[PDB]
C-alpha cells in the first residue's frame, strides 16, 4: 500500500477523459513539447487523457493526443514522457470522499502530488500537500 490510505475512486478507466483542477478551473494539459500545465479552454487538443491501471491504485496518465505520459522528476518537476517509466507512475485516490489525487509513486514518501495553481502553472512535487486545492482533480468525460 506503500504506507498511504486506499480510499479509491468509483471511476473506471474506459474512457478518456478530461483533468478538472479544482483550484483554479483548469484542465490538465500536456503540450507537445513535453510542457506541462492548465487551461481553461476547453476546445485545447491536449487536454484529453487516458488513464490506465498498472496495478490496483496504480496509474498511467497517457495523453491521448500527443501519447506522452505525465511524469514527475527527480527533483519534483511535472514533465511529459516519451516511453512510459518509473516516473510516470501515480497513485490515484479519493480525497474529501469525493476528489481525486495523484500522489508520485516515486515519491510516494514525500507526499508529491501532481497539482495546478489557480494561474494553470504546475506545483513542483515538495511544494504541493494534503489540504491543497490544487490537488484536487475531477475526471470529465470528454
Given at each position: 500500500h506503500?504506507?498511504?490510505?486506499?480510499?479509491?475512486?468509483?471511476?473506471?478507466?474506459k474512457?478518456?477523459?478530461?483533468?478538472?483542477?479544482?483550484?483554479?478551473?483548469?484542465?490538465?494539459?500536456?503540450?507537445?513539447?513535453?510542457?506541462?500545465?492548465?487551461?481553461?479552454?476547453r476546445?485545447?487538443?491536449?487536454?484529453?487523457?487516458?488513464?490506465?491501471?498498472?496495478?490496483?491504485?496504480?496509474?498511467?496518465?497517457?495523453?491521448?493526443?500527443?501519447?506522452?505520459?505525465?511524469?514527475?522528476?527527480?527533483?519534483?518537476?511535472?514533465?511529459?514522457?516519451?516511453?512510459?517509466?518509473?516516473?510516470?507512475?501515480?497513485?490515484?485516490?479519493?480525497?474529501?470522499?469525493?476528489?481525486?489525487?495523484?500522489?508520485?509513486?516515486?515519491?510516494?514518501?514525500?507526499?508529491?502530488?501532481?497539482?495546478?495553481?489557480?494561474?494553470?502553472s504546475?506545483?513542483?512535487?515538495?511544494?504541493?500537500?494534503?489540504?491543497?486545492?490544487?490537488?484536487?482533480?475531477?475526471?470529465?468525460?470528454?
Amino acid at each position: 500500500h506503500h504506507h498511504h490510505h486506499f480510499n479509491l475512486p468509483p471511476g473506471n478507466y474506459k474512457k478518456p477523459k478530461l483533468l478538472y483542477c479544482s483550484n483554479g478551473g483548469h484542465f490538465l494539459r500536456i503540450l507537445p513539447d513535453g510542457t506541462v500545465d492548465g487551461t481553461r479552454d476547453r476546445s485545447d487538443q491536449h487536454i484529453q487523457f487516458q488513464l490506465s491501471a498498472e496495478s490496483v491504485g496504480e496509474v498511467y496518465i497517457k495523453s491521448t493526443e500527443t501519447g506522452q505520459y505525465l511524469a514527475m522528476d527527480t527533483d519534483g518537476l511535472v514533465y511529459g514522457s516519451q516511453t512510459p517509466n518509473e516516473e510516470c507512475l501515480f497513485l490515484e485516490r479519493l480525497e474529501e470522499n469525493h476528489y481525486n489525487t495523484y500522489i508520485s509513486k516515486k515519491h510516494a514518501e514525500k507526499n508529491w502530488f501532481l497539482g495546478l495553481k489557480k494561474n494553470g502553472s504546475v506545483k513542483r512535487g515538495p511544494r504541493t500537500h494534503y489540504g491543497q486545492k490544487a490537488i484536487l482533480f475531477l475526471p470529465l468525460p470528454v
